[PDB]
Amino acid sequence: GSSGSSGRLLGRNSNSKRLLGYVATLKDNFGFIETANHDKEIFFHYSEFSGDVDSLELGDMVEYSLSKGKGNKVSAEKVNKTSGPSSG
């Protein structure tokens, strides 16, 4: 993160839950995420992703959230890479 000019990355955190997923596909414009059920897919733009979308690969874990009612059309927002539990 470092410090300096501080762009627009931080926002609000209180009415937004956290979720995880797995990079299903990585293109040269947008990517997809496979949920735990492996029945649906999330849509996130490179502009929405804050980190190293170019470094991301297939199988890696990521953090995202949802903010829509019941529907087939779902998309993520403010996506960012995140680590998980493992032998350190």
Pairing between β-strand 41-45 and β-strand 30-34 as defined by DSSP bridges: antiparallel
- Measured CA to CA, the distance from residue 84 to residue 66 in angstroms comes to 20
Here the CATH number for the domain that contains residue 81 is 2.40.50.140
SS (H, E, C) 41-72: EEEEECCCCCCCCCCCCCCCEEEECCCCCCCC
- Measured CA to CA, the distance from residue 28 to residue 9 in angstroms comes to 22
Strand order in the sheet with 61-64: 41-45, 30-34, 19-26, 61-64, 80-81
- Measured CA to CA, the distance from residue 88 to residue 80 in angstroms comes to 21
Domain that holds residue 52: 1-88
Number of separate domains in the chain:
1
